[PDB]
Amino acid sequence: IHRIRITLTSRNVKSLEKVCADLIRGAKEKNLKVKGPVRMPTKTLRITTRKTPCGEGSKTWDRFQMRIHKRLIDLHSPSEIVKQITSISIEPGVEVEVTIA
């Protein structure tokens, strides 16, 4: 089968959407039937940390939250074409997992 799946994950929604638009245009630059970007639920990671290094004062905490936004682009094409589209200076912080089955 030639259905190549890009599991692309990044911390920024705007950079993620720019990557997705560029990738889907590069697919749209060629003759490749594609599906729309599939947005899996963003992982919200919570870390609640006491602020004072030594326990003193009012009970105060910081709440660091990590938003991880993940799109999938599965296109009906050999992975070589997708790699040809890939060399476009991918946005930093956007990681790509390649799925071939």
Binding site: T48, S58, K59, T60, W61, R63
Partner: protein, 138 residues
């Protein structure tokens, strides 16, 4: 046909599929006369007998429910039924009696059409609850 327009309360929701059927209202494989709490059945028969049991003349309404809490599902299941009745009565048939029944159930209450925007707030640290704080030490 799917003229469903939500019908919600808290985080639980109902979708009222409506068609030209038998006039029997179904709630996920069980009749509205038999619901798990065994206590809010009147809250479910309120809309139909308030507007009139005679209105249903061959309309099959299946509501599918999903969300947390039984009573939270109610006030939305019945809201979904009222929404489906509104959609059916707006699609083809007149509006004068539609406005009549709408005025009657609006003066009856407000939670039959418009959803309650309320929701459970977060809890703030430094206390047992969102607004409650711990006891002062002297």
């Amino acid at each position: 046909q799917s003229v469903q327009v939500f019908g919600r309360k808290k985080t639980a929701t109902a979708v009222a599929h409506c068609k030209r059927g038998n006039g029997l209202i179904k709630v996920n494989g069980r009749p509205l006369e038999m619901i798990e709490p065994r206590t809010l059945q009147y809250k479910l028969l309120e809309p139909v007998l308030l507007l009139g049991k005679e209105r249903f003349a061959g309309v099959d309404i299946r509501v599918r429910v999903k969300g947390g809490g039984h009573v939270a599902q109610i006030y939305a299941i019945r809201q979904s039924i009222s929404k489906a009745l509104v959609a059916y009565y707006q699609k083809y048939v007149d509006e004068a009696s539609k406005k009549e029944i709408k005025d009657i159930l609006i003066q009856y209450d407000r939670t039959l059409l418009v959803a309650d925007p309320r929701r459970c707030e977060s809890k703030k640290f430094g206390g047992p609850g969102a607004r409650a704080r711990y006891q002062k030490s002297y």
